[PDB]
Design a protein around this ligand. Structure first.
Ligand code: CL
Length: 310
């Protein structure tokens, strides 16, 4: 268990797209951002690594390691300071994704938390929930996949703290994504991403599925809300990896060639819920899938549950 790394209140991330459709990356700005947000991505990667190790069994030390890291960032007020804006709101997006990773790790490991760790971490996760939610009160902040990703941290915080108010908030974010699906299966704000339209439909599906999967921890079946809409979106994504012609036509751009990876592992859960599970076999075959922003090993969590049994 390495020492908990510094948890600064402040973030200074750098946007890295060159075009209006946020579809072409400036590699210089991407390298700059990677360096600027390295502490945040490293924190996420490690707490997820520790949570995955805990889930293997006979490794409570790993679970406690995640809690030591989370408690250290809670006590330093990590990410609750200045979201510095350079060329866009990348700092806010990083706080959304890192809150999600931290909240997922806490949800997975909290059975081992001490009394002080529970109070420290839950207060911090609720403060991050309020701060990230307040970002979305400005209607100029378009509620695309970033909004659904914000729901990951809010939902994990809601389940871990058994907070019915935060649960209602997260349900609203999930349902906003479901309600945004058009009859043809598209999410218009993701379809506007030109060569990355398929990528962003995949990336928008990921937090929606993860939220519904966390709702199962409270016995709820969120897939019954507008039942079938999420399937239309998920099926478009699976179809698009086989044949991008629909995404090509509807986005106006030939899709970037890519294989499912990382957050695409929402399919590991969703194939267990879909009325047509085998349509997702080709995506499943690209696994296993790991993503710290979604709690770690999605392939294993879909089989063993998000929260390991103590
Ligand atoms: Cl079931």
């Amino acid at each position: 268990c390495p020492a908990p790394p510094p948890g600064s209140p402040d973030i200074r991330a750098i946007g890295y797209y060159t075009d209006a459709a946020r579809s072409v990356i400036d590699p210089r700005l991407k390298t700059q951002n990677d360096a600027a947000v390295k502490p945040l991505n490293a924190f996420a990667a490690h707490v997820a690594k520790f949570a995955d190790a805990y889930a293997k069994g006979a490794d409570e030390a790993a679970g406690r390691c995640a809690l030591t890291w989370l408690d250290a960032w809670a006590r330093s007020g990590a990410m609750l300071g200045r979201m510095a804006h350079v060329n866009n709101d990348q700092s806010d997006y990083m706080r959304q994704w890192t809150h999600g990773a931290a909240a997922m790790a806490y949800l997975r490991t909290q059975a081992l938390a001490s009394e002080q760790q529970r109070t420290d971490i839950e207060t911090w996760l609720k403060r991050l929930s309020a701060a990230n939610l307040a970002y979305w009160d400005n209607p100029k902040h378009k509620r695309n996949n970033h909004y659904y990703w914000t729901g990951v941290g809010i939902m994990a915080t809601a389940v871990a703290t058994r907070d019915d108010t935060l649960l209602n908030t997260a349900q609203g974010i999930y349902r906003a994504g479901i309600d945004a699906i058009e009859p043809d299966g598209r999410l218009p704000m993701e379809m506007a991403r030109k060569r990355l339209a398929l990528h962003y439909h995949d990336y928008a599906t990921a937090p929606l599925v993860l939220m519904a999967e966390m709702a199962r921890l409270q016995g709820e079946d969120w897939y019954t809300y507008r039942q079938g809409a999420l399937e239309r979106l998920a099926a478009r994504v699976a179809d698009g990896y086989r044949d991008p012609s629909w995404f090509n036509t509807q986005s106006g751009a030939v899709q970037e060639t890519a294989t499912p990876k990382a957050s695409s592992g929402w399919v590991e859960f969703y194939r267990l819920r879909s009325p047509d599970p085998m349509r997702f076999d080709a995506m499943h075959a690209a696994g296993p899938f790991q993503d710290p922003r979604m709690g770690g090993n999605l392939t294993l969590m879909a089989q063993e549950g998000i929260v390991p049994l103590p």
